[PDB]
């Protein structure tokens, strides 16, 4: 299971600091803040270049927290040390997209042009006119932006069209 | 690409012999040369999935369950294993397993006998 799985630390430049509510990690690309709810029985202690944690008592909710915050902490560390990427395959006869500064705009089969706003700390790249890569510091923001841009022209089984999750295999149907 | 199973001899056109990565003129001539006298039997062949189709041509032995007439002395009756018309001897089974030993993926004689008997068990025939 997860929670007693020891968490590695990066002591080169990344560092951690904990509060009653704040858990902040600082690395090469910005900082990541996790705001815990109050009265948490899960206790944190860190050794030199090592992190081990556990719940103090035995309850269902406590054991849920014991794994969930371990997962969020390792996610935050991996993000602040690398930064995640989401690749969107833009497939279509005329569909395309590009970037105008802060705006990520697209060409659809829509009469009304489509644009989207980019949150702070997020970067987008259009290496070719039919594909998007969205790079960020945490998986939460990149997933939110991906599902925000996906909400137009979901893929259909009769013909591969729209936005694909890059090995999200489309299950086709009888095209008659 | 997929498996191949072609008659031994002359076959200029095949199910896939123009877009697999080989010339039919450079294939069927040697296919018939290797099986000039072996024509008239449905012989198992294998084609490689390699990108260039390098010359590693191989052939297998004539299939079992079509030659069981010689081995088990029967006239191909009901295919169930609960009805039988004859019995298989030892000499015929040993001869056919010795001939089929080149088809096996192991060098053992009694294992070949048992394989051929188990394959012939489709008829329900076992050594008496």
């Amino acid at each position: 299971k997860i929670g007693n799985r020891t968490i590695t630390l990066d002591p080169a430049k990344v560092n951690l600091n904990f509060q009653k509510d704040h858990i902040a990690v600082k690395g090469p690309l910005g900082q990541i803040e996790l705001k815990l709810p109050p009265n948490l029985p899960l206790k944190f202690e860190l050794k030199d270049n090592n992190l081990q944690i556990t719940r103090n008592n035995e309850l269902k909710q406590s054991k849920i927290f014991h794994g969930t915050y371990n997962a969020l902490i390792t996610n935050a560390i991996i993000g602040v040390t690398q930064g995640f990427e989401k690749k969107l395959r833009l497939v279509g006869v005329g569909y395309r997209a590009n970037v105008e500064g802060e705006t990520l705009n697209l060409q659809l089969g829509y009469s009304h042009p489509i644009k989207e706003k980019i949150p702070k700390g997020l970067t987008v790249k259009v290496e070719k006119n039919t594909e998007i890569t969205i790079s960020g510091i945490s998986k939460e923001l990149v997933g939110q932006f991906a599902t925000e841009v996906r909400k137009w022209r979901k893929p259909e089984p009769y013909k591969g069209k729209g936005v694909l999750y890059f090995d999200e295999v489309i299950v086709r149907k009888a095209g008659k | 690409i997929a498996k191949i199973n072609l008659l031994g001899g002359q076959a200029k056109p095949g199910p896939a012999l123009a877009s697999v990565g080989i010339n039919m003129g450079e294939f069927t001539k040697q296919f018939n040369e290797k099986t000039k006298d072996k024509q008239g039997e449905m012989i198992p062949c294998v084609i490689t999935a390699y990108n260039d189709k390098s010359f590693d041509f191989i052939l297998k032995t004539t299939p079992v369950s079509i030659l069981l007439k010689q081995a088990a002395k029967l006239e191909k009756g009901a295919k169930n294993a609960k009805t039988i018309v004859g019995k298989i001897t030892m000499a015929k089974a040993k001869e056919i397993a010795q001939y089929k030993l080149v088809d096996l993926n192991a060098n053992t004689v009694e294992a070949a006998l048992k394989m051929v008997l188990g394959t012939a068990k489709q008829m329900g025939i076992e050594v008496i």
Binding site: - | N105, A106, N107, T108
Partner: protein
């Protein structure tokens, strides 16, 4: 089972101590059809090949009078090539196989009883 594991320990210890030379090699990401092709190649050979756990080798290698052990079964698919004479042909077979693979990954063992590297064992099998 556990008593079966102990009996297998005894059996493989006996089999290993009956001979004197043996080499374990890692051939990883392989296939089963080529493996039965291997079994065809080694049938003439007096040696054989088997697949067997780490702990059993750890407890059996020090009873078969072999030294040079820190990892007796690790890092990929594991087998054993214990040759009681004419291991040459078996070594040639494995060399051709790793030629069919991408690179050689030596683990342990020696031709006749003294753990040694593969920089010369390959040339022995080449």
């Amino acid at each position: 089972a556990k008593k079966d594991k102990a009996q297998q320990v005894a059996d493989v210890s006996h089999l290993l101590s009956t001979s004197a030379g043996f080499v374990i090699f890692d051939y990883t990401s392989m296939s089963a059809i080529e493996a039965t092709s291997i079994r065809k190649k080694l049938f003439k050979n007096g040696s054989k090949i088997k697949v067997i756990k780490n702990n059993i080798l750890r407890r059996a290698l020090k009873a078969g009078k072999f030294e040079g052990i820190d990892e007796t079964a690790i890092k990929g698919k594991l087998a054993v090539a214990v040759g009681v004479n004419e291991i040459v042909e078996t070594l040639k077979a494995v060399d051709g196989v790793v030629k069919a693979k991408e690179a050689m990954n030596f683990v342990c063992g020696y031709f006749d009883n003294r753990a040694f590297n593969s920089a010369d064992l390959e040339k022995i099998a080449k």
